[PDB]
Design a protein around this ligand. Structure first.
Ligand SMILES: Nc1ncnc2c1ncn2[C@@H]1O[C@H](COP(=O)(O)OP(=O)(O)OP(=O)(O)O)[C@@H](O)[C@H]1O
Ligand SMILES: Nc1ncnc2c1ncn2[C@@H]1O[C@H](COP(=O)(O)OP(=O)(O)OP(=O)(O)O)[C@@H](O)[C@H]1O
Ligand SMILES: Nc1ncnc2c1ncn2[C@@H]1O[C@H](COP(=O)(O)OP(=O)(O)OP(=O)(O)O)[C@@H](O)[C@H]1O
Ligand SMILES: Nc1ncnc2c1ncn2[C@@H]1O[C@H](COP(=O)(O)OP(=O)(O)OP(=O)(O)O)[C@@H](O)[C@H]1O
Ligand SMILES: Nc1ncnc2c1ncn2[C@@H]1O[C@H](COP(=O)(O)OP(=O)(O)OP(=O)(O)O)[C@@H](O)[C@H]1O
Ligand SMILES: [Mg+2]
Ligand SMILES: [Mg+2]
Ligand SMILES: [Mg+2]
Ligand SMILES: [Mg+2]
Ligand SMILES: [Mg+2]
Lengths: 292, 292, 293, 295, 295, 292
């Protein structure tokens, strides 16, 4: 971290990481390892928990029973070597499905050390430093034993390797595959991404993500569930309000669609509250006015 | 390089190598040689042996009798000047079929001093350091005479040279090409590489890897073999389990996909046991349920 | 590195024993650094007779390169008969450029500087340039000399504005000493490359003699297979090398060497297993089964 | 000497050392040994005690039992020869975490003779004078049998040797390695060093510092203890003031940062009192500390 | 080290100024290197800049006063709490030309502390170990002249982030500076004050030693108005045509030095006729500055 | 210095006690201040059997150094068996080189001159050359003599124009005096360096015999732990030394001494607390202090 504020952020992240577990006090880091630590996200920083995300009850339960307990509880799962947590985890679906919120909840509830690295922080201007950054990132995730590495926009980073791509990026991707699944066995390291398209991911990179969570468009019951959890603690009508009519009228709708519709429905009456304040339950009419 | 932890790791690996071969104690190493010494994998670090490999028995036997025995038994093969070890070995194939585990078994059981090198330790930002590091790698391999230098993801390291290549990468590849096969002949040093796109490798580098092993997608009997060696030391149903149906129904399944399928079957089979422990024999239904 | 200094002393002693006139020659520090890369004929295991399929190329290389350089009294009558200032061995990979390089290091008798870019490069400022200058000065001091740069398409790559300042200064210094105001003695630069087009034009000019080590023909491949299978037991009746040479279309010398090694291993696997507890004669089925045919 | 203040300080330090140890009056010193004696630090000069350090009580106790007591009392540990004091001690860690506070506590509370030699008194422009200075430093430490040679910022003095190093520096480092752990066995001399860049120290010098104390950035409980120690003999509010929150949100703050925060908090608390006095002190509050603090 | 007759005379003159400034300073004596440092001191007579000559930094000037100057110069007022003492170091960092050396000059003249404005050429020396002795004598002299502020202009170069590639004298010099700045021996009323543009260039251990940090940022609209009003003092201005407010709005992104140059160009263009008459004054107007301003 | 003169008289008296025929030898003032820095056997408390893990090196050092220097008649039959004029106990730090020097000082019986560079360099011009000349003259006069220069790498560093003129003429004088030492008297210069490469090659070739004291092996570390833990009470069953030896990867002799010291302190801290108002040493006390 060249910047002083980056160094301060690194110190804050390291102090919080030591606070979460004192077993990291004796662990000594490298310079690029501290640079990777700069992006480490702590559970207190994340606001979204697994209780916040709804409608994906089969997917949330699958995520729990196949990731959280296999990784954080090796004592329980140590009966066989096949019961370990997988090398990678994939989340794929259409845009606007709240996969980033799923990653936030997967960071928080688990309490696993989380690195939310990006393509920009990995690439460095000097020659050969992107590979060293990737190596120190994997070394840090090995040092922080119950750690999850998260990459958002994984389709760009795990993009298929061709002959027309930049040599720095191809070398970086090959180094990433070497450290991800190579001779040197990783610790309890799980790489996690959210992609709009699964075809963009390389087949070798698709191999390193053996479990894929289809964050599919919610079904009618699941649309109702997400409408309920994204209208929580919203001052609405007790008698007139009916979520099922909105769920039936919203066919082929994503989470972002319902989120923006609820946002507009709240704002149009917040305006009237401001108007009265210058000198509060809603109704169906706001929701169904948008519906046609 | 000059880091305290890296120096301790280099001393540990050198002590392990001296323990493996008492004759190695009297040899001397340069500073760059000590630097590349940190990339050496000792047999104890690898948890995968040759017998953990299934479905590649013809490949295992051919690789032994054509790669390991000519290299590690030179007195036996010294009867003819055409029985030496190949100057290079390429393990290429579709992802999952086990090239990395081939290299793991070679690191554990061949008895050769292994050098698992990634690109990050090779590339250096300073001018002329990467070429000296490659020269030191080859000199160290020559000094530890039955050595193996393994480059996972060798396609990016040995890509087809172009005018658009970075100068340091191009000079790096040319220096590697020179030391690999030049006037100053190497000892019993062999470069083993792993890749998926064999055509991505340079033609003059594919020449230096003559003994190429096509680790292709396993067949039905092969897939039965990986399913059997994956499900060892695990409780199975005596009558209900029918692994032949699982092997036949896993159409187009790589080794890693097979491992993930086995792990998922074990998880849904032992969910109840894990729930009981937090406060189940495997059957055909567990495997076929995750199978599609 | 003490190994480097010991190597320099050993090669200097070898060159002094080879040429008594070299004893009184004094060298600078960077000259000794280059002297670390001197290749003596004792380090090369291969003579010119082991290169087969290039006999016209070998003879022409001799008459145009080795004889005009090693014996200047024979060619001194006419000034046009001077040995070339550079030689390029370009072609497809595996056809035998380093074969001729090792043979020139062994049998020509010229002092050999098989330099690599690891020795030429230096992290400190103004050190790579002085290393190249001392390389040329040392080659001038060891008056019949051959400087070899394997994979020369990288050292002498086409110059661009994106090139590093130290490497641009390096290539310019190489150009200046290669053919500048102060002409060299009997110093000839020899290079090998897979990509001749990547070499700079101002360097391709400085390599006037160009040997195209092309892909071997049928008779050439027969010569390579006869050379590689020398001192190896062959079947008098079954084994016929002409069929094998004809069948191996588009095979370089390295591919033929790998075919010979694999065939010998397949033939002698039973001998190997007996040793684990004579060599079987090599047959045409043994070679042809491995080959695609 | 070559300076009136230097000679006066030499005489004063020698008198203090003679008063501390009556048997030291019979010991004669060389001119270079007197120049080293000019750098003797007595406890009366140091104002920090071990009680003035907070958040390092496990480290303070470990340092005591492994360094101070094995050196100060050898009769308790003399039942076995393996209980002797370490030859060197390295206090390494990020800056501002209390390494020189521990050094001051070692100077005052431990009771060992303390030399806080600086790199100016060691280096000399002449030939061989620096090496004679180092040799006399080690001889003086041996004469003052329970000595501690403290060298603040030992990373620069004991940096990795190289050909680029001046010949006097390389000769100096070789002389230090010879006297420190070489053919002649030292007395109860311990070389205590503080640094921020442990990796800069030579490996051959690092082996001569076998006891290593890592003074890292303070934790939340450590920050609370440090703030409680720093805010002693102050007027604090009985109900408004609460140190726990303030220790909580000062993430990544070293001891120096906490001292600065307390300093500016005291200044802005008393600002009205100074305004009155220039023409009592307001008790400190949590809003006062968190106003200067950036949260 | 190296001394000259003119340098000796300058040191003698500075010593006379110090003795006249404080009678108790006459009884102390100095070393040769202390006298060398004496040449780098600054008296209020040599400075023509007052704290009233700085515009736009009035809250920063008041904060600097209350947190820096008053605790250092009247410890009797602040002696009720030990946490009221002056900071060990103060960093004046910001974009270039914003007024850091203006603040330092006003500090040297109006605060009244013995000011040592040291430059990098007086510290470095080719001879071995002379830089460390120069720094040691600098700190000893600053302790001798008890209220003392040591100014290192462009302190980023002196206190740059240490690395293994640093010269042995540079690294030893910086380690000696860190040892004396805050080490075993507590400094007296000595404060090291440094101006810089590259705060990020400074090592973390040095930034630890400069806890009070002042950001002299680029001036705002009101700040630019105050700077222009200060610069245009004792210069005739048009009663009606001049409008400093509009000028202040249009000079966006200007530092104090840029505004000084704008005023210089405007004044020269105004007085060109007067200079033509003198070779063989018009009051300043808005168009004078506007013809140069590039809004 | 009066103390220096007292030390000189004490050393000369001890030498006269060691060799009765040595009383006749006359001294110069430079020879006296050289004599001030020599070491007698009683000052050394380290004996050859106090060094563990170096018994092959102990025997080689004996047969090539101790006997040829002490018994010249026996080994004068072949010039190869004669004592070399230069011995270099080089190796990694903390492996026993200066302990080997201490044992050579105490057990040889040869007059050991352990000089330091503080006694050789001098500010006055020409005094250092007289010091070195008197050193070699005293080595001549004390007929069995070993000039031990601890850290000879700094003395014998590569000559450069940046070095002082006095340093250059000192190195020239030392080369002049060192050459001709073969077959003229029995004087051998013993050096001990961490970094052999720092030695100037012209001075390096004056040391033909080289002893590599490398990092100890597992068996050597077991022997070192056995030697260090002598006259110390150990548990009969709970204490196994081979576990400590195998767990101390890359540990030098100094590091092993520190580990034993801290383990003994940790085990005896309860007895120390009782005394201020000994437990047998066990494997657990080592392993809690040790890192696995
Ligand atoms: N022959 C085999 N025997 C047993 N298990 C196998 C075999 N091949 C693959 N596997 C299983 O599949 C996984 C394959 O991982 P491996 O590291 O071999 O893939 P890879 O070679 O890195 O793939 P890629 O081509 O994407 O680089 C292993 O974890 C292993 O459990
Ligand atoms: N003309 C030849 N005669 C005999 N053997 C040959 C010939 N050409 C190649 N070979 C065999 O092939 C092997 C490799 O040849 P060589 O090393 O000359 O290729 P190369 O020129 O280095 O390839 P590249 O052009 O990629 O650098 C040699 O060991 C040699 O045994
Ligand atoms: N553990 C602590 N307990 C109480 N106060 C502390 C502690 N650590 C630091 N401080 C306060 O912070 C200031 C830091 O001074 P200190 O001597 O620790 O710095 P230093 O160790 O010299 O710096 P460096 O780490 O760069 O050598 C001290 O004045 C002290 O008041
Ligand atoms: N706040 C201000 N009020 C009035 N004039 C100012 C102010 N700041 C700067 N100036 C004018 O700008 C000129 C330069 O300011 P100063 O010398 O403080 O910059 P500096 O801090 O030395 O810059 P650098 O960062 O490049 O060292 C001064 O002569 C002054 O006239
Ligand atoms: N081979 C060994 N056998 C027994 N004890 C050893 C051995 N090596 C080291 N030790 C112990 O560790 C300590 C190491 O100090 P020693 O003087 O041997 O190091 P050194 O030779 O000075 O190393 P360097 O010169 O590289 O600093 C010794 O006091 C000794 O007690
Ligand atoms: Mg792979
Ligand atoms: Mg070639
Ligand atoms: Mg300090
Ligand atoms: Mg300035
Ligand atoms: Mg030693």
């Amino acid at each position: 971290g060249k910047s002083r504020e980056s160094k301060a952020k690194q110190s804050l992240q390291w102090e919080k990481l030591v606070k979460r577990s004192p077993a990291l006090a004796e662990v000594t880091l490298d310079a690029y390892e501290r640079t990777i630590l700069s992006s480490i996200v702590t559970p207190d920083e994340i606001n979204i928990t697994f209780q916040d995300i709804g409608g994906l009850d089969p997917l949330i339960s699958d995520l729990h029973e196949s990731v959280i307990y296999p990784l954080m509880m090796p004592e329980v799962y140590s009966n066989s070597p096949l019961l370990q947590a997988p090398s990678g985890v994939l989340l794929y679906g259409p845009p606007g499905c709240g996969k980033t919120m799923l990653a936030k909840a997967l960071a928080k509830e688990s309490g696993a050390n989380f690195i939310s690295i990006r393509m920009s922080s990995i690439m460095d201007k000097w020659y050969g430093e992107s590979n060293k950054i990737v190596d120190a990132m994997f070394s840090l995730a090995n040092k922080l034993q119950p750690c999850i590495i998260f990459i958002d926009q994984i389709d760009s980073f795990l993009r298929e390797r061709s002959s027309t791509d930049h040599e720095v990026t191809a070398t970086l991707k090959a180094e990433f595959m070497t450290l991800w699944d190579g001779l040197l066995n990783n610790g309890r390291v799980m790489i996690i991404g959210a992609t709009n398209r699964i075809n963009d991911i390389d087949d070798a990179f698709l191999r390193r993500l053996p479990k894929r969570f289809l964050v599919s468009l919610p079904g009618s019951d699941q649309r109702y569930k997400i409408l309920s959890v994204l209208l929580k603690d919203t001052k609405l009508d007790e008698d007139e309000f009916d979520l099922q009519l909105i769920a039936d009228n919203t066919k082929g709708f994503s989470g972002s669609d319902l989120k923006e519709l609820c946002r507009e429905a709240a704002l149009d009456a917040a305006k009237e509250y401001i108007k009265q304040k210058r000198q509060r339950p809603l109704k169906t009419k706001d929701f169904t006015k948008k519906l046609r």
